[PDB]
Amino acid sequence: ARYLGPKLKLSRREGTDLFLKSGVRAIDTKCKIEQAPGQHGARKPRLSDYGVQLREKQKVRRIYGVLERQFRNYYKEAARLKGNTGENLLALLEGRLDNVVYRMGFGATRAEARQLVSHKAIMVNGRVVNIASYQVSPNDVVSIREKAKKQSRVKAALELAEQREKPTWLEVDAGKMEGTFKRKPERSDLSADINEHLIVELYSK
Amino acid sequence: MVTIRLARHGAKKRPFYQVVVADSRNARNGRFIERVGFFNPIASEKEEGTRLDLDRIAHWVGQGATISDRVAALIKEVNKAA
Amino acid sequence: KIRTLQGRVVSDKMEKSIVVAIERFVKHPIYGKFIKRTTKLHVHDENNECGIGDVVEIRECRPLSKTKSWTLVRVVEKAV
Amino acid sequence: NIKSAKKRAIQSEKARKHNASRRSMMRTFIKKVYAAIEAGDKAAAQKAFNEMQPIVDRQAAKGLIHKNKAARHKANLTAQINKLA
RNA sequence: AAUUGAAGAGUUUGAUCAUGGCUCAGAUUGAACGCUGGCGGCAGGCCUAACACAUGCAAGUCGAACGGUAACAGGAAGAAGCUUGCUUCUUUGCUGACGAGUGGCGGACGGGUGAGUAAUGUCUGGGAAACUGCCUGAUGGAGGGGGAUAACUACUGGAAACGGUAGCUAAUACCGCAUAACGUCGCAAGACCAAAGAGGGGGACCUUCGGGCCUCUUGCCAUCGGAUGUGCCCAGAUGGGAUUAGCUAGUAGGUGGGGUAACGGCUCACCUAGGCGACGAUCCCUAGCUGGUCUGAGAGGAUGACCAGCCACACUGGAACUGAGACACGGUCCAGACUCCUACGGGAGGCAGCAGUGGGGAAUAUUGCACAAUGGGCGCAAGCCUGAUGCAGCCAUGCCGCGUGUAUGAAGAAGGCCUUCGGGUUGUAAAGUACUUUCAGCGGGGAGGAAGGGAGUAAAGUUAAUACCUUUGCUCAUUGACGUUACCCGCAGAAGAAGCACCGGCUAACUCCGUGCCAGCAGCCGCGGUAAUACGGAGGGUGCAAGCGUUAAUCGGAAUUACUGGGCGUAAAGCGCACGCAGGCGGUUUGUUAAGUCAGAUGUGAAAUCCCCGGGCUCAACCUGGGAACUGCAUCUGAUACUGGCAA
């Protein structure tokens, strides 16, 4: 029900940093990125069309830490909502509670944020939410409880929040350790390199 | 006999009762002439918990319909407004 | 008013009764073609004024025999 | 079978007997009427009709003949005597 | 706001293009099987043998209808050990109550199953010739008598089941008599038709001093309405077969008699000789139908498990009786097959109610708890009953959610596998280090489903009455099966928690070793006869994940039945050619109609489900509010271009 394995291996099959070990240090430096996703990893794949579509879907799931039935349900919900299904799908992945806890700098990675969410260290709107996939509405206040406030992790995580780009659709404020999800993220406000038409076309075959 | 009575429709350990007008010898969740309101015994402490069409109820009691103890209690709860 | 139909007499020979074919003109559900379609009805008439080949209006009443739940109102267009 | 179905069995037998007797007397009076119409007798059949009328109305009221049937009888028989008289 | 909706590929050939079949990639399921398996929420769970059933429950209730007392607990009276003050025993239905019985009501509901039924069914829309317990409104009546019969007692038959005979008693049981309509018959005149009391309380009066009498509540009867439910009719629609073309004598219609609640060949007598049928009758095979479900871009195709509406069935075949309602699942009668008891004379039974067995099968669950809620029956109510229902148990059967940690960590450790022996890879993976405690485990706290019901008051109404009863407030104890509930807090420690398939192409993911046309694999193409990316193992990777594969089944892809949306010179496909009936289509102008067509309105298209916008469960699944939708049918109002009818 979640991955639990070598993370930088997943980041190495995709060829791109999936932010799976954000943590203390800088850019990887001990990953052997691009070089060998397994034993025959030095081989160029010469990847197919199914391979590029598949590999795009796997990039997105392995970023946000979602498995397939849950992702597939996000595609059905993004499909039925009015508008653009790629952009709706990223809006559904960005409203996840573990993601919003990661974006605010409360967790160093999304797995650490998922353990903060999971171990009842996070309230939304003054109610404790235990669930990684809670869908944070706009104009909500998500914060850390009094237990697990001033624990080392979150402090260190806010320390590495300043190294990243400070997302526009949040009120990050780390003094009180509370945040406000203000609006839904625009497609132009996130990541610029994921090709969601490939995963629309992957599920539409 | 036609009866204005409750009919259990929510999930397990979470009932939602719909007050209907049925021929009394039907099943509880079976055939009804018309539904006329509802009663959620939880709902939350928000706004309603219960709405209930008093004009149609007065119509059926004018016709000769009987009323169970809960529906009488709900009409005694929502008296005219509260 | 009353609901009535129009049709033509298809046969005659029965003892104060008649039988009338009705032509309903209905679209085919799959193919979208308007197709003629009959409905033969055993119709009552007191004193059997209408003969074969007529055109007669017809209304529904109580049962008068087996099938026979239809009775004429007006014989038109008898022309031989 | 072991219930209050035993009581309904014995009551329905008792009421079967009672109803069979009253139904049989009613039918014999009606046979008096249109067995007097079999011969060409006007006032004899009128006497029999006056003899059957209270019992057929009465068995209609008691609940074993369901009064429309009651009506039919007297209606049919009235027709017979004014077919005759 | 409520349709944002459509993918291909492999294989005919030396190669090609086309045709064309086969096959794969998706979604789904009441699933089964194999390997594996942590928790929870919500659902689902005999698809086969409508096979046979042990055992326990599944329909009772009312003494405020009645005679009554079998118990239980009191009361009165008597007698006794007598502690002259408490026990023991006895007569009394005197009382709260109540076994058995009569009687009223319910056992036609609820619950099960899908055998039969291809149209006496179902769906949609009309209709007329109807009945309707309980419930409601209105108008009125509710007077006066009689004979019985259970129970009971006494005999008595029978092994039992079950009876018989003779007496006794009651009623809201039964029967007359009176009374009689805006009721039935009748054109009228007229004729005729019913009933039942019980309970609470009481000032005065009368008491045969039991109670009359007054008042209230409730019940009875009659008629007309209403509501609900049911019966009947019509039209359209709802499988396959023409290698099934004729079927039908109560058959088709009429008149009259009878019958039903009601029309009707429903039935009978007579008369006519019809009726149905290629727009598919009749026969045969199959089948419960629908809202819906699955698939689909859609049109369609398949299906109709759960949930809900309708029908049918209740061991098998038939029949009626009682009743408002049945031709009756836990009723009667007969017959039959099976099973059982027997004293051999005869008797008894019916899980397709809920659990459960045996069998059958690839396959499907507990002989649980409670009536606390909702509903039902009875009752004035209290309450009693309820295997409906609420819940719990078992099962990864499905859907949904969460977990198996998190960060750091290069000596790129050891070991495995490969190696062009340089190294590479497993791999930040592990170990180390630093944190976190979800869920499981342990200990505390603790909502909500609980509204009612009972006991006292106070006021109002009624009344002769400050009683009784009804209604409304107020107060007082209370009413939870689930249930060591949901949820909250604290404890200890990463501590209890990852498999399954695949890796030649389709199709994401590669090498080594073993085997050598073998062993074996395989959905199709096809691999294997010595260096096999296809077999078996290992390392590595890929996909899914408490699941994963295989199998079965459906739709898709399949434009390979083409209505949307195909073809026919040579690929399959133009009758050998004509004439022609039924059928389909029909030049051109004007007028009328308005059937098709179009527009609007109204009634209906059950609720749930799908869709949209919201709301509640920490979220989700789930539940839910409002709308849209249900593409239809009927009627009315219009328009008249096109098609049809009619006239020229």
Q: How far apart are alpha carbons B29 and B27 in whole angstroms?
A: 6
Judging by beta carbons within 10 Å of its beta carbon (0-12, 13-18, 19+), is residue B32 exposed, middle or buried?
A: buried
Sign of CA dihedral A136, A138, A141, A144: positive
**SS3 state of residue D79:** helix
Task: Please report, as a single letter, which amino acid is at residue A3.
Answer: Y
Task: Using the CB atoms, write b or e for C16-29: b if 16+ within 10 Å.
Answer: ebbbbebeeeeeee
Nearest to C5 by CA among C72, C64, C67: C72
**SS3 state of residue A93:** helix
Sign of CA dihedral D71, D72, D77, D82: positive
Q: How far apart are alpha carbons D67 and D25 in whole angstroms?
A: 17
Nearest to A102 by CA among A148, A170, A150, A193: A170
Q: How far apart are alpha carbons B2 and B21 in whole angstroms?
A: 7
Q: How far apart are alpha carbons A15 and A55 in whole angstroms?
A: 10
Q: Measured in angstroms, what separates residue D10's CA from nucleotide E341's C1'?
A: 26
Write the CB contacts of C26 (distance below 8 Å, at least 6 apart in sequence). Answer: C34, C35, C37
User: Can you read off the two tokens belonging to residue A201?
Assistant: 């076309």
Q: Quick one: DSSP state of residue C47?
A: G
* Count helices and strands in chain C by DSSP H and E runs: 0, 5
Which residue is closest to E328 in terms of CA–C1' distance?
D5
CA within 13 Å, CB half, A21: 17
Write the CB contacts of A147 (distance below 8 Å, at least 6 apart in sequence). Answer: A121
Q: How far apart are alpha carbons C73 and C6 in whole angstroms?
A: 10
Q: How far apart are alpha carbons B49 and B7 in whole angstroms?
A: 16
Q: Cβ atoms within 10 A of the Cβ of A55, count?
A: 17
Angle between helices A68-80 and A49-64 (to 10 degrees): 100
Angle at C74 between CA C73 and CA C76, to 5 degrees: 155
Method: cryo-EM
Q: How far apart are alpha carbons A63 and A22 in whole angstroms?
A: 12
Cβ B8 to strand E below 7 Å: yes
As beta bridge partners, residue B61 has none
3-state SS, A96-164, equals: EHHHHHHHCCCCCCHHHHHHHHHCCCEEECCEECCCCCCECCCCEEEEECCCCCCCHHHHHHHHCCCCC
> With contact defined as beta carbons under 8 Å apart, do B38 and B52 qualify?
yes
Q: How far apart are alpha carbons A137 and A160 in whole angstroms?
A: 26
Please give the radius of gyration of chain D, using alpha carbons only, rounded to the nearest integer: 17
Q: Cβ atoms within 10 A of the Cβ of A185, count?
A: 21
User: Can you read off the two tokens belonging to residue C41?
Assistant: 């009805």
Cβ B65 to strand E below 7 Å: yes
Task: Please report, as a single letter, which amino acid is at residue D11.
Answer: Q
Write the CB contacts of C30 (distance below 8 Å, at least 6 apart in sequence). Answer: none
Nearest to A185 by CA among A162, A171, A169: A169
> With contact defined as beta carbons under 8 Å apart, do A1 and A133 qualify?
no
Q: How far apart are alpha carbons A144 and A176 in whole angstroms?
A: 9
Chain E nucleotides reached by a protein CB under 7 Å? 4-7, 25, 38, 41-43, 59-61, 101-107, 109-111, 126-136, 174-177, 183-186, 191-195, 221-223, 226-229, 232-237, 251-255, 257-266, 271-277, 279, 299-300, 307-310, 321-325, 328, 330-332, 349-350, 373-377, 388-392, 399-410, 412, 417, 424-429, 434-439, 448-453, 472-473, 482, 488-490, 498, 506-511, 539-546, 548, 563, 583-585, 595-597, 606-607, 611-613, 615-620, 622-625, 634-636
Chains touching chain A through at least 3 C-beta pairs below 8 angstroms are: none
Q: How far apart are alpha carbons A191 and A188 in whole angstroms?
A: 8
> With contact defined as beta carbons under 8 Å apart, do C9 and C50 qualify?
yes
For every residue of A188-201, DSSP letters joined together read GGS-S---HHHHHH
Residue in the block written with tokens 């979470």:
B14
Region for residue A100 given its phi and psi (left: phi exceeds 0; alpha: psi -120 to 50; beta: otherwise): alpha
Write the CB contacts of D37 (distance below 8 Å, at least 6 apart in sequence). Answer: D45, D77, D80, D81, D84
For every residue of B17-33, DSSP letters joined together read EEEEEEETTS-SSS--S
Region for residue A25 given its phi and psi (left: phi exceeds 0; alpha: psi -120 to 50; beta: otherwise): beta
Q: How far apart are alpha carbons A170 and A153 in whole angstroms?
A: 21
Q: How far apart are alpha carbons B54 and C3 in whole angstroms?
A: 39
Task: Please report, as a single letter, which amino acid is at residue D25.
Answer: M
**SS3 state of residue D37:** coil
Q: How far apart are alpha carbons A199 and A86 in whole angstroms?
A: 8
User: Can you read off the two tokens belonging to residue A123?
Assistant: 């309230």
Q: How far apart are alpha carbons A65 and A99 in whole angstroms?
A: 9
Phi and psi angles of residue A56, each rounded to the nearest 5 degrees, phi first: -70, -45
Distance of CA A159 to the CA centre of its chain: 19
Angle at B35 between CA B34 and CA B39, to 5 degrees: 160
**After which residues does chain B have a break in its backbone, defined as C to next N over 2.5 Å?**
none
Sign of CA dihedral A26, A27, A32, A37: positive
Q: How far apart are alpha carbons A153 and D40 in whole angstroms?
A: 120
State which H helix or E strand residue B50 sits in: strand B50-52
Task: Please report, as a single letter, which amino acid is at residue A53.
Answer: Q
Judging by beta carbons within 10 Å of its beta carbon (0-12, 13-18, 19+), is residue D11 exposed, middle or buried?
A: exposed
Q: Measured in angstroms, what separates residue B28's CA from nucleotide E29's C1'?
A: 31
What domains sit in chain A, N to C, each tagged with a CATH number? 7-93+190-204 (1.10.1050.10), 94-180 (3.10.290.10)
Q: How far apart are alpha carbons D70 and D58 in whole angstroms?
A: 9
User: Can you read off the two tokens belonging to residue B78?
Assistant: 């929502």
Judging by beta carbons within 10 Å of its beta carbon (0-12, 13-18, 19+), is residue A111 exposed, middle or buried?
A: buried
> With contact defined as beta carbons under 8 Å apart, do A95 and A135 qualify?
yes
Residue in the block written with tokens 């018309």:
B34
